[PDB]
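Thread: Modeling a multi-component assembly for a lab meeting

Hi all, long-time lurker, first post. My supervisor asked me to bring a structural picture of a complex we are working on to next week's group meeting, and I have zero experience with this. I have the sequence lines for every component (1805 residues in total). Could someone generate the structure of the whole assembly? Inputs are pasted exactly as I received them:
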Amino acid sequence: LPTPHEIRNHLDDYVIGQEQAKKVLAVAVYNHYKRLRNGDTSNGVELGKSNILLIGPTGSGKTLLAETLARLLDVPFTMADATTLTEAYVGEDVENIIQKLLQKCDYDVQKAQRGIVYIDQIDKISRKSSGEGVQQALLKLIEGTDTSKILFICGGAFAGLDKVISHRVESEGELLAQVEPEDLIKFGLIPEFIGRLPVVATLNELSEEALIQILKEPKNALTKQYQALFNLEGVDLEFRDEALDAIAKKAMARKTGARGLRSIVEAALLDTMYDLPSMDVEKVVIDESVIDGQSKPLLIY
Amino acid sequence: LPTPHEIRNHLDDYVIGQEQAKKVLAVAVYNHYKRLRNGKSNILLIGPTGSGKTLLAETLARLLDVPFTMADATTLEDVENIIQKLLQKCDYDVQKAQRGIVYIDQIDKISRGEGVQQALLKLIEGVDTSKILFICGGAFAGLDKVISHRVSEGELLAQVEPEDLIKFGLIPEFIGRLPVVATLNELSEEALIQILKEPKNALTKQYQALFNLEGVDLEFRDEALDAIAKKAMARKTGARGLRSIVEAALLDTMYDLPSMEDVEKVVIDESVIDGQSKPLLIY
Amino acid sequence: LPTPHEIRNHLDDYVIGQEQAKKVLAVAVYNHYKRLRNGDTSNGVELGKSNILLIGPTGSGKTLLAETLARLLDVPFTMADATTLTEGYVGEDVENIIQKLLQKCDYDVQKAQRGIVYIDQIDKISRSGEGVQQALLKLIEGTLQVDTSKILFICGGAFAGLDKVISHRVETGSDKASEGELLAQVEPEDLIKFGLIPEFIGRLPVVATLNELSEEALIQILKEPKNALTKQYQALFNLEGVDLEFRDEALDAIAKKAMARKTGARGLRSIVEAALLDTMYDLPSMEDVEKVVIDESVIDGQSKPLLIY
Amino acid sequence: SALPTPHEIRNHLDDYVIGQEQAKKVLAVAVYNHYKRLRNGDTSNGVELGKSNILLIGPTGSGKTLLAETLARLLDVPFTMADATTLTAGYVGEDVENIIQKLLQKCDYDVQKAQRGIVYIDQIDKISRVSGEGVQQALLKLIEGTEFLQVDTSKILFICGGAFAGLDKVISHRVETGSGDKASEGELLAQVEPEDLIKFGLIPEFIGRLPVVATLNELSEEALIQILKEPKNALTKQYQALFNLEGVDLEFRDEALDAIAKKAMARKTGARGLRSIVEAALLDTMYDLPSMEDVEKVVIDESVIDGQSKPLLIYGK
Amino acid sequence: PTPHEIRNHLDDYVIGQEQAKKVLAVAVYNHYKRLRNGKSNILLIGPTGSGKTLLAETLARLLDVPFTMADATTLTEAGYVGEDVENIIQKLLQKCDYDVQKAQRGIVYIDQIDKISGEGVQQALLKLIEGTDTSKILFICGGAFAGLDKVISHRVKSDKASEGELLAQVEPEDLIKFGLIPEFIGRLPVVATLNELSEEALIQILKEPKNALTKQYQALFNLEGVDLEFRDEALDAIAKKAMARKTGARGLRSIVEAALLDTMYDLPSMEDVEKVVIDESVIDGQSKPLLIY
Amino acid sequence: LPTPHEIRNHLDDYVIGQEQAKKVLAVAVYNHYKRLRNGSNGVELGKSNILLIGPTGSGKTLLAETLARLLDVPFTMADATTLTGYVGEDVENIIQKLLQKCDYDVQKAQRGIVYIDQIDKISRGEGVQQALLKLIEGTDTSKILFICGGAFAGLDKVISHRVESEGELLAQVEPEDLIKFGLIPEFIGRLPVVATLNELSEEALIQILKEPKNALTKQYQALFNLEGVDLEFRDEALDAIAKKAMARKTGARGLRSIVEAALLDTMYDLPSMEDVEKVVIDESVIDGQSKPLLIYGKPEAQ
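Re: Modeling a multi-component assembly
Sure thing. I ran the full set together rather than chain by chain. Output:
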């Protein structure tokens, strides 16, 4: 098994920032499978399963984190939506997420027990005051009937949670750290459900400096990918710092997070990529070319 | 023998606050044994987890030198096992056994357990399980809301009525056997402390087993457990906020533990409440 | 066997009011056991078993009535809650009722067949709850090896909603006399619209309605029954060598307050105990001759009981 | 032994049920053919015999339920009732098996007897068309066939009774659309075709399994009267036997019986509301009867419909 | 044969449906005309017993071309549907004498395609319409489409629109909303509609199918040791009455059961050799079936 | 390889309008195969599957088939509706149907293009998105290009609810807009390239009837040609067909049904008469009133 140190390190390669949330997941995950290999019992005491609750803005990395730690653990992974299952056959449907897990699991019961399950938009199922019924149906899953062995991760934006925390205690990232199970209670989640989610991870909103960092530093960074594309044409693609900043700015205005990044970049390079193979030594993308879209990239011969 | 005045006085030494609940327990208990000495009233404890429910029960049993036994509704013929468990601590003396006290925890959990209510009810009535006093504790997390709807949370509990319990999930015949109802508003620091270490699945025990897989011995100093309870009462989350407090104090330690060779680890309070110092590491 | 007349007379001693319902029960009961003694068959035709359905507000005497008529017939009695039957199929729960009957019956099959079974809160299972009606329905008919046929079944229920559906039907293509007068017009189909299945209602031919207890009734309940609250507390204060007296105005005040809460005779004890709590607490530490509870002490709770030395 | 001819089966139905001659003729044939098929086997000869489950259509309290119970009795065959509204969640298919185990219980756990058994589903019109429709399809798997007995629900006979309040109108509209004679429910229920059930809410594949359709005529005043005295377990006979244990002779003037019927028609409960009407009229009498010395008691219509007068008491001994 | 000639020959086998016969004539002619010179597939939409199957079988005879029938329901709900596909081809090859040439000229009729909209079958069945060579053969898909008439109405003139006319306004989009996949409909460019039932089809339904009503009742009467016979005129009278009610093949059983009800009732109480059902017994219901001792 | 310039030029010949969508496809396609040929340098290039968003009969399917032809690459179609239990066998079936037209060659198969129609239909079905998602990545289905077309009738409204003509609005489309529509995040992330199609103009419909290689007019003219007859469509007639096609809003789809109806009678009794040529006017099409004009070849008669 990989030490929490190792797991976090490999998470740093797929996700930028969120160091705290990653440290948490690393430990929660490590202890989880460490329990399975040794058995829930022993020694004279029954260890407790520790399902995870991911709390962060949309486009923060919640889903990616889940998919990633499943990959670096060569463990079968499956996604599900709390809203898609919110209304339906009812709870009978919830068992189907197991057959979807079994499918990617090759029908092997042992690997399936190792599997990880990510439930998205769990904050949506809580009543604003049918959705609550789902929490209880999905609650039966969390315990087991065996769904016990498998790890459950539940992500959500929790837009309102931010306010109730400020209210109870009377700085966005700071407030999230102060979150308590009772705060989720006032949000709409039932006590018996939250008790099944002991491990609570908070994800900070991406900074303008973060987006910039995401554009160039990751191994699969957008800039690196396009530079490699322009590289096949024998052309050298260069992004000015001011340009990267301009992209981030525009990405925050749309509040899509790191998601709207690629769409912004591809649009700024669309024209260039089109008539490139029919003509250069290198091409330079300035902020005037990105945010304004008025000027075409600089062409060097 | 002990007057209600005297009984409450002795209760004040074991639990703090809850003057009303204690006044009620004193009278209920006094009347119960007073009717036995001269030859059908029980108690229902409603309060948050860690409010002293269990302690109060255990206490009034001690100050009455009467055999005491606990039982959990979650584990409810195990019914007859509660009497033989009472008989064991009773030395198998039928007389002392009938004077015995029985505390049932988490009865609010069995209110949809409904088949348990009837089975547990036959006991309350009537070894003749008629003379023994029954005290049933429960959190009743939902009861606070139904009382409000019947038309803050502390004053509301005072207005609780058997009908409210009916809407909660308790059957009429069961509630009729629990005429006396006492409510609690505050948690007991000592209770929380007790919860952290004494239960079979106590937090401390769980983490000790976790650290055990690493071949490391985890030790909680008493001062530490008390610092955890204190903080838990400041947030008024009850026994719920306990785990979140403990995990946070052990988070760092759990992270870089599998990468070092330690004999044992000691969590002092300065590590918990202050969070300023890391646990002590012994090689 | 005691004539229906005699049965009703002995019910008058344990229950206050409800003269109509008691007349019904008396007849139903009398006919039931009269059938068992002569056999369901004969002569050339099969008599029909007549289980009862009690419909009345909470704390009106439904349970007491059942318990009582069991006593004055020296017949084994057992209680059960329809709610407990819902918590799956509970075929074992359903049959559990019989072994609990057998226990109080001394394991005697004959006495068990004579037994009476009261199911409380049946209105609660009206349309997992339905499944219970059907499972409980198998009981009513019959199958320890004991046959549940011979045994009488009484099913009580508040039926809060029933009052409205009867009005919706009996209305005229308002106002209705009263809740009690409306209950009298109750019909098997009205129970149908409430949530009870036809096959179940057909097994409950005898329908008895209970009117809300009067303030004068509540007062009567506080002092006249053998186990009256006032008598119980007077005996309690008696152990301390003190004489407890309730002024008539006080008993009235208790009733008044009990009707405001609409708990019926149920909320009586909680009211009385609250008024005497303080007094019971510091009583064993003082020397009094007697104590007097006035209406100012009960309804207002502002003044403490009068202490005589 | 030998099976009872349709003739014989109808004759014995006459003893327990008043009127409904046509319906009874139908059920008789449907039932006779059913068990004749089981004895001979579904296979052969050179052709596959078709199972013929029955669909009872009649107003509430018209004898649908009784008719089912009866033909079961006179065929010494295990019988079980079920309610369609109970099945209509997802554990309906499980409760389906519960109908079989409830049959098995009364069957003495014998697989052969169970296969002969009869199953009556009440209020099928209630589940008409999404959650209700699903049940039709879940109950439809039953009709065909598949602590477990592993028996095939095929062999057993299925009867499905329902009021079909709206069905009366849709049939009229089908006939009204073309050729827009007296409306008469009777000359309409007889005209009903499977497609009419379709427009009502029943799925095609379901109706196809209910090939035999027996309709029940609304009870006349005369029928009710006839029901109160002529059947073997008639109300009057039952009460007369009750009053007989007291050594008293109970008599119902014909005038009383009609007054009961009238009142029963006003409530439109059918034969159901009959017992309730009668017991209310004899309640007082039954109460103070055991405490007095009478020769006989006479119930007049003034005692029933008006309830103002108590029964006439004759003294003798 | 010219489309003129083809229609003329179709008139001799089926009555009415002049329009659908005109379309079929053109679709068929164009299909084989393109083959001779080296996807004009047909979709039949009509109530059950309108002649859909008869039409397909007929134009196959008048073109001396191998014909084969298939049921979409047999294929559905299985993974061996793709294999049963080749089974349709080998079934076509058998009646074709295993001559590849004649096989490619063959016609294939798929019945109850509206039933599968089953959607995994549309795809499986689609790969056939295209080609592997199942390209040259003509495909005709029949269906009742009971729900289709309603979606066309909703798709949206005074005095409303007759059902026989509403179907003439059918469009591929309407089929889409019905349940058929776009790629499947695109392979069935030719759509023919029928407004009238076929007396001859219904008659055919009463006696020829393996589970035919007449066969069923004959077996029932067989258990009594009685021989039940249906005179041709009787079967005809049943069909007629069935068309007046426009219930289709559905209203057949109800008609037959009524004509045999009395007889079935008092049959087990008498000793007969056989029983004959005439049209006077069916349509008029005035005379009881006829009893040979 | 063909430059995006060249690819777009050849698309112009088969598809009318959609200049923007075709510019996008050209780039996406070009970069895709350019990646396969080269596999570097020190960074991993990202596969760029395409998501076609446009009304029915706008050219989505045609575009896909076309760029497959002008790249001599195996092509296969599939419908997201047929994919809706798990249908793991259906999902992989798309591969064997691709292998069939691919001649069982693994290399050509990796080059293949796959078009999934009606993806908007399976929007939150979700299970299919995830099963189809495993495809997009690879298990190798990685090398092959995926194009997913959909009408997204509701998408137009949600975009307006956020951004607050139809074609101008589609240009403002964002991955989050698809999210609110019903598509799962992990699926949209696999569809980086988004192309929007404009509604076709009447001039376009007219252009589609006569100019494409498989144009309807050409197909029927070849049909009438086997009878030795010359079929001619008057400009006014082609215009009348387009008009009627726009009234039904079926797009280029309802074109054939319109044309076939106008030539039905004629095709029926044609093989039974001796004509030189046939002229279809706008009166015969939009009105359905007058039969086509029949011109008789010189006898022949004697």
